Design an enzyme around this catalytic site. Sequence first.
Site, PDB file in Angstrom:
ATOM      1  N   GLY A   9       4.308   2.925  -4.735  1.00  0.00           N
ATOM      2  CA  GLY A   9       4.601   3.592  -3.487  1.00  0.00           C
ATOM      3  C   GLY A   9       6.084   3.846  -3.335  1.00  0.00           C
ATOM      4  N   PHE A  58       8.275   2.147  -1.499  1.00  0.00           N
ATOM      5  CA  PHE A  58       9.057   0.915  -1.503  1.00  0.00           C
ATOM      6  C   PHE A  58       8.251  -0.291  -1.979  1.00  0.00           C
ATOM      7  CB  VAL A  84      -0.004  -3.512  -7.435  1.00  0.00           C
ATOM      8  CG1 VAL A  84      -0.802  -4.644  -8.072  1.00  0.00           C
ATOM      9  CG2 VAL A  84      -0.046  -3.614  -5.922  1.00  0.00           C
ATOM     10  CE  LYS A 127       0.688  -5.100  -1.369  1.00  0.00           C
ATOM     11  NZ  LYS A 127      -0.487  -4.852  -0.488  1.00  0.00           N
ATOM     12  CG  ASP A 172      -5.808   1.578   4.411  1.00  0.00           C
ATOM     13  OD1 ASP A 172      -6.441   2.643   4.587  1.00  0.00           O
ATOM     14  OD2 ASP A 172      -4.902   1.461   3.560  1.00  0.00           O
ATOM     15  NE  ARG A 192      -6.325   4.874   0.860  1.00  0.00           N
ATOM     16  CZ  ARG A 192      -7.046   5.440   1.818  1.00  0.00           C
ATOM     17  NH1 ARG A 192      -8.051   6.257   1.539  1.00  0.00           N
ATOM     18  NH2 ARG A 192      -6.756   5.178   3.089  1.00  0.00           N
ATOM     19  CG  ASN A 193      -7.045   0.214  -0.040  1.00  0.00           C
ATOM     20  OD1 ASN A 193      -6.296   0.399  -1.002  1.00  0.00           O
ATOM     21  ND2 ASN A 193      -6.685   0.479   1.210  1.00  0.00           N
ATOM     22  CG  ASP A 201      -3.462  -2.272   0.333  1.00  0.00           C
ATOM     23  OD1 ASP A 201      -2.570  -3.026   0.777  1.00  0.00           O
ATOM     24  OD2 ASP A 201      -3.278  -1.052   0.130  1.00  0.00           O
TER      25      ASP A 201
HETATM   26  C1  9OO Z   1       0.435  -0.799   1.519  1.00  0.00           C
HETATM   27  C2  9OO Z   1      -0.025  -0.519   0.085  1.00  0.00           C
HETATM   28  N1  9OO Z   1       1.005   0.192  -0.668  1.00  0.00           N
HETATM   29  C3  9OO Z   1       1.315  -0.301  -1.996  1.00  0.00           C
HETATM   30  C4  9OO Z   1       2.108   0.799  -2.686  1.00  0.00           C
HETATM   31  C5  9OO Z   1       2.253  -1.546  -1.903  1.00  0.00           C
HETATM   32  C6  9OO Z   1       2.487  -2.318  -3.031  1.00  0.00           C
HETATM   33  C7  9OO Z   1       3.335  -3.433  -2.965  1.00  0.00           C
HETATM   34  C8  9OO Z   1       3.963  -3.775  -1.767  1.00  0.00           C
HETATM   35  F1  9OO Z   1       4.790  -4.869  -1.720  1.00  0.00           F
HETATM   36  C9  9OO Z   1       3.744  -3.004  -0.634  1.00  0.00           C
HETATM   37  C10 9OO Z   1       2.900  -1.889  -0.703  1.00  0.00           C
HETATM   38  C11 9OO Z   1       0.070  -0.598  -2.898  1.00  0.00           C
HETATM   39  C12 9OO Z   1      -0.310   0.288  -3.907  1.00  0.00           C
HETATM   40  N2  9OO Z   1      -1.378   0.021  -4.684  1.00  0.00           N
HETATM   41  C13 9OO Z   1      -2.078  -1.108  -4.499  1.00  0.00           C
HETATM   42  N3  9OO Z   1      -3.260  -1.466  -5.313  1.00  0.00           N
HETATM   43  C14 9OO Z   1      -3.130  -1.046  -6.709  1.00  0.00           C
HETATM   44  C15 9OO Z   1      -3.602  -2.090  -7.726  1.00  0.00           C
HETATM   45  N4  9OO Z   1      -4.907  -2.618  -7.376  1.00  0.00           N
HETATM   46  C16 9OO Z   1      -5.392  -3.571  -8.379  1.00  0.00           C
HETATM   47  N5  9OO Z   1      -5.403  -4.878  -8.081  1.00  0.00           N
HETATM   48  C17 9OO Z   1      -5.860  -5.789  -8.996  1.00  0.00           C
HETATM   49  N6  9OO Z   1      -6.297  -5.364 -10.204  1.00  0.00           N
HETATM   50  N7  9OO Z   1      -6.283  -4.019 -10.504  1.00  0.00           N
HETATM   51  C18 9OO Z   1      -6.686  -3.389 -11.675  1.00  0.00           C
HETATM   52  C19 9OO Z   1      -6.484  -2.053 -11.508  1.00  0.00           C
HETATM   53  C20 9OO Z   1      -6.800  -0.967 -12.549  1.00  0.00           C
HETATM   54  C21 9OO Z   1      -6.427   0.370 -12.478  1.00  0.00           C
HETATM   55  N8  9OO Z   1      -6.908   0.978 -13.581  1.00  0.00           N
HETATM   56  N9  9OO Z   1      -7.574   0.029 -14.318  1.00  0.00           N
HETATM   57  C22 9OO Z   1      -8.249   0.287 -15.603  1.00  0.00           C
HETATM   58  C23 9OO Z   1      -7.524  -1.140 -13.717  1.00  0.00           C
HETATM   59  C24 9OO Z   1      -5.970  -1.857 -10.255  1.00  0.00           C
HETATM   60  C25 9OO Z   1      -5.852  -3.135  -9.644  1.00  0.00           C
HETATM   61  C26 9OO Z   1      -4.829  -3.331  -6.113  1.00  0.00           C
HETATM   62  C27 9OO Z   1      -3.789  -2.807  -5.119  1.00  0.00           C
HETATM   63  N10 9OO Z   1      -1.745  -1.967  -3.565  1.00  0.00           N
HETATM   64  C28 9OO Z   1      -0.700  -1.775  -2.761  1.00  0.00           C
END
Ligand code: 9OO
Length: 299
Positions: A36, A38, A41, A61, A158, A162-163, A176
Site C-alpha cells: 500500500g 504506507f 505484507v 505485516k 472491511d 480480497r480479505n 486484515d
Molecule cells: C489496511 C490494509 N493495507 C495494507 C496495505 C497494510 C499492510 C501493512 C500495514 F502495516 C498497514 C496496511 C495490507 C495489504 N495487503 C494485506 N494482505 C496481503 C497478504 N495477505 C496474506 N496473508 C497471509 N498469507 N498470504 C499468502 C498470500 C498469497 C498471495 N499469493 N499467494 C500464492 C499467496 C497472501 C497472504 C494478507 C493481508 N494486508 C494489509
Amino acid sequence: PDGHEYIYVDPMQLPYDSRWEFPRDGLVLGRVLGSGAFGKVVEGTAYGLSRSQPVMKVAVKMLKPTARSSEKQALMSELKIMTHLGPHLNIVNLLGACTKSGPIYIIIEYCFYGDLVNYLHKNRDSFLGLTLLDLLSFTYQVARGMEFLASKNCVHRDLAARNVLLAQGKIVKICDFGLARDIMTFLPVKWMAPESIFDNLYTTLSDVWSYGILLWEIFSLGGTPYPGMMVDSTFYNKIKSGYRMAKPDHATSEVYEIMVKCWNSEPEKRPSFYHLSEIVENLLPGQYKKSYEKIHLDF
Ligand SMILES: CCN[C@@](C)(c1ccc(F)cc1)c1cnc(N2CCN(c3ncnn4cc(-c5cnn(C)c5)cc34)CC2)nc1
C-alpha cells in the site's frame, strides 16, 4: 450498565502478553504479498517460532518508512485486537510479533493459495477442479468466522473477497483487522451498508451487508460489485432508494435469497451469522458438517 461494578473491557487498555514477542533476528523477510501507500505484507521464514516447525513459512505485516505515526498507532491497535480475540479456524491467526526495539511486525499464518479474488480468476475455466460445492464451502466458513468475530463484539468493517484467504486443505481464513473496531480515510463503499456510509454506524449487522457483497463476489467468480457504476451522488441515491445487484451468473435462487436478506434496508431484519451458517449448512452435504467439526476440533 446495570451498575458501576460492570465495566466494558477495552482491548486497547489490556497489557501486551510478551509470550507473543518473537526475536527480530529469527525472521527472514521475503517477497511482497501485498503493498500500500504506507504499509505492506511480506512473506517470511520464522526460525524457532514453532516446535512442530522449527523453520516455518509465515507472513509479516509491517509499515513502510513512508508511514507516519497515524498508521503506526493503528498497527499497534490492530495487534491488541488480535491478541484479545483468541484463535479460530477461519481467521488468519496471530503467531507472534516484533514490538520491542523498532518498528512493529505482526506475524500471521501464511495461506498457500492467496486471496479469493485472484483464486477465482485463475479457476474460471475450471468452472464448467473447482465446483459449485467449493463455493458453498467458502460461503459457509466465512459465516463461521464472522460468527466468531461477532461473538467477541468485533466489527470487521472491511469484509470482502480480497480479505478472504485460502490456506492448506481449502480452509477459509479472514484477514486484515486494520479497520476492525470493538463495538462502541478511504472507505470500501461498495461493501458498506447505507447506515455505515450515511450515518458512520458500523455494527455486526453492517458486516452482514458486506457478507452479502462478498457472496456476490464468490458466485460471480471474482466479479466487481456494481460493475460499470461509478460511486457518485446517483449511486448513493440508488443504494438509499433500494437498488440491489442482480443475481450473478452461477448463484442459485437459494443463494441469491441469502444476499437479498443480507441487503435488507432495516439493519435488524438482516440475519445473524449464526442463522447464516445454519442456512448454508442445509445447502451442503451432511458429510460436510461432520467433516468440518472434525477439522475445527483438531485445530
Ligand atoms: C489496511 C490494509 N493495507 C495494507 C496495505 C497494510 C499492510 C501493512 C500495514 F502495516 C498497514 C496496511 C495490507 C495489504 N495487503 C494485506 N494482505 C496481503 C497478504 N495477505 C496474506 N496473508 C497471509 N498469507 N498470504 C499468502 C498470500 C498469497 C498471495 N499469493 N499467494 C500464492 C499467496 C497472501 C497472504 C494478507 C493481508 N494486508 C494489509
